[PDB]
Amino acid sequence: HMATLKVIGVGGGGNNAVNRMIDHGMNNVEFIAINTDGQALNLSKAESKIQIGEKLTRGLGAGANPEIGKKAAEESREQIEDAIQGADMVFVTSGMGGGTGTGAAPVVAKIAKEMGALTVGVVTRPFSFEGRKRQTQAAAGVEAMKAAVDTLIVIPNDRLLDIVDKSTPMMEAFKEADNVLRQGVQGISDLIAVSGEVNLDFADVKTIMSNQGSALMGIGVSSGENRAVEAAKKAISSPLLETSIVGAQGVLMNITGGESLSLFEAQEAADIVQDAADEDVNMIFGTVINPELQDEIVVTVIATGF
Ligand SMILES: Nc1nc2c(ncn2[C@@H]2O[C@H](COP(=O)(O)OP(=O)(O)O)[C@@H](O)[C@H]2O)c(=O)[nH]1
Ligand SMILES: [K+]
């Protein structure tokens, strides 16, 4: 069984993350671009491009009207179903607040879930300087996303203001937000790709993300002494997340290292995750021994059950 992963960007921000992720390099992952704006769709790097609402918008965007984005997605449902067909897992990424992403993303996610695919949502909330009316429209879209996905990850754009200095280019900040989705997809792709000493597969991912709600996906790489503890702290500690690790009652943790991987340091990483959750976590533990890795360790964490 080779799992089919698809990343679908809905709207301007979602299709921007898709384009940037394609530049960074992402194989075995098929990309789908959905948008009402034909101008931006023509500039997409994705192999599957779907233009919605051409009759409602005449090629333009939703003009901040979520109703238009929702109607455009439903009118093009069969075109979305065809592009998704065959996918075992789908990542719907979109920026909430606008018309297309706010109204179309929940429709694309509902279609994916009804297509029988594991549907994960990675959406952003608008900056506070964009106004309160846009934060309210984004909340409705977030609530609509949570009802149509198996698992949801919200990234408030204000958190970007915490990881930047006064000169950080805006594009460099957006790339930090893109890492949440990209590395979460790569971690899942790597898990299904290699057979581990303590093996986890796509069935484990389904059991941890199926019909849960909020979730956290993080990866952490470290070296030297205390690498296990430091890697685990990086995988669960992200300043861009609305849903933290605290309160998680279900975790899928995979530690990847060389032949030096110690049982003692594996328990350290697990304890770090459970202690940080401050809950009695139902954990699914896996271990992969990559002899190429020298003194570096990788901790992948998928946390749900909030
Ligand atoms: N982090 C991030 N947020 C974005 C990006 N592009 C747009 N957004 C956010 O997404 C919201 C909706 O914008 P957009 O997706 O382009 O509108 P739409 O195409 O009509 O859905 C905006 O309020 C932005 O705050 C991006 O590249 N990165
Ligand atoms: K595996």
Curated annotation (Swiss-Prot):
One GO term of the biological process aspect: protein polymerization
Top-level taxon of the source organism: Bacteria
Summary of the function given for this chain in its UniProt record: Essential cell division protein that forms a contractile ring structure (Z ring) at the future cell division site. The regulation of the ring assembly controls the timing and the location of cell division. One of the functions of the FtsZ ring is to recruit other cell division proteins to the septum to produce a new cell wall between the dividing cells. Binds GTP and shows GTPase activity.
Binding annotation for GTP: 12-16, 99-101, 130, 134, 178
Protein name as it appears in the record: Cell division protein FtsZ
GO MF, any single term: GTPase activity
Record's subcellular location: Cytoplasm
Organism: Staphylococcus aureus
Keywords: Cell cycle, Cell division, Cytoplasm, GTP-binding, Nucleotide-binding, Septation
Disulfide bonds: none
Signal peptide (residue range): none
Listed GO CC annotations: cell division site; cytoplasm
Quaternary assembly: Homodimer. Polymerizes to form a dynamic ring structure in a strictly GTP-dependent manner. Interacts directly with several other division proteins. Interacts with FtsA.
Shown residues in whole-protein numbering: 12 to 315 of 390
Family: Belongs to the FtsZ family.
